[PDB]
Design a protein around this nucleic acid. Structure first.
Ligand SMILES: [Ca+2]
Ligand SMILES: [Ca+2]
Length: 314
DNA sequence: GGTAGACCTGGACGC
DNA sequence: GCGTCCAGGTCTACC
């Protein structure tokens, strides 16, 4: 059937593969784990979302990542298009190599890694990432996903409709900086997060020099970027870290939330040295991050992603 | 320079 | 049925 969301079984001719063993990627451990909030499993084992300003559905077999795009006559994805997918999942970095290293220097990680393979990091767009995580604070993944959806529906470009689901592209700075955006987001249920989105959009545009400012941060240092991001309304060290790690190519940035905070205590018997605070404080959180960085190396952020993901289930 | 509440929302959760 | 607790925290007003 030419309608609704596709499935590998339903329309074989429209799918193309990317060699990728499950040990290098587990869609179900990555897509709904709080990295990106734009993917839904519309059909069992099939994930649909907007990627590179187009709609896709992904599914995998033992050794293959099957992809299908919705753009003209319906046809399988092209090599170039497939490359978009590869870049998005940063498939050039070998998860096996990282897992080996982390596992060799951390027994606990080895134990977790034995049951949660294929958890890698997505390379996300700076804008989409920055605003998605501004919506993530003092909130749960289920709700956050809804908020980002209505945000895109209300201020993003309409892409294509599958069944009764209409996909939108992520809003632009100009749209987010638009008049009365906050009031609207409020009526959309983003709570006090509403003002953050408007204020941060207006600030990057009317004070930091626009989109270029954000993108330039990808070349800047982690210390650099993190400091820069913390300027924006609604962006603290934790949100700043999420953005550095997932969108600004800072693989050593380690987001420290409640999850990573309980993980450090329960799994590593970790306690603040540079402080005596009772809960995650700006100083203790800073210290935990260094701890993890010192324990896992240059890709500590990625190691964190595996544990955060695993903790969402366990 | 460490440190207590105050938020929007809405699934649990225990009562 | 229903107040509490809490989730990928940030912001800010006393110490
Ligand atoms: Ca909390
Ligand atoms: Ca800030």
């Amino acid at each position: 059937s030419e309608f609704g969301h596709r499935t590998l079984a339903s329309t074989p001719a429209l799918w193309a593969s990317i060699p990728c063993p499950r040990s290098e990627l587990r869609l179900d451990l990555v897509l709904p784990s709080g990295q990106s909030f734009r993917w839904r499993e519309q059909s069992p084992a099939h994930w649909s979302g907007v990627l590179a300003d187009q709609v896709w559905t992904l599914t995998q077999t033992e050794e293959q990542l099957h992809c299908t795009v919705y753009r003209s006559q319906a046809s399988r994805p092209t090599p170039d298009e497939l490359e978009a997918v590869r870049k998005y999942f940063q498939l050039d970095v070998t998860l096996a190599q990282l897992y080996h290293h982390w596992g060799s220097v951390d027994s606990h990680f080895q134990e977790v890694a034995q049951k949660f393979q294929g958890v890698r990091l997505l390379r996300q767009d700076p804008i989409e990432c920055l605003f998605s995580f501004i919506c993530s604070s003092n909130n749960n993944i289920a709700r956050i996903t809804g908020m980002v959806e209505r945000l895109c529906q209300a201020f993003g470009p309409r892409l294509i409709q599958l069944d009764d689901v209409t996909y939108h592209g992520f809003p632009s700075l100009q749209a987010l900086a638009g008049p009365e955006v906050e009031a609207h987001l409020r009526k959309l249920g983003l709570g006090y997060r509403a003002r953050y989105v408007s204020a941060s959009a207006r600030a990057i545009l009317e004070e930091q020099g626009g989109l270029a400012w954000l993108q330039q941060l990808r070349e800047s240092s982690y210390e650099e970027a993190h400091k820069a991001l913390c300027i924006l309304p609604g962006v603290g060290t934790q949100v700043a870290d999420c953005i550095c790690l997932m969108a600004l190519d800072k693989p050593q940035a380690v987001p420290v939330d409640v999850h990573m905070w309980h993980i450090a205590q329960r799994d590593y018997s970790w306690h603040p040295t540079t402080s005596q605070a009772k809960g995650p404080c700006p100083q203790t959180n800073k210290e935990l991050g260094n701890f993890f960085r010192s324990l896992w190396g240059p890709y500590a952020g990625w190691a964190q992603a595996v544990l955060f993901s695993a903790d969402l289930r366990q």
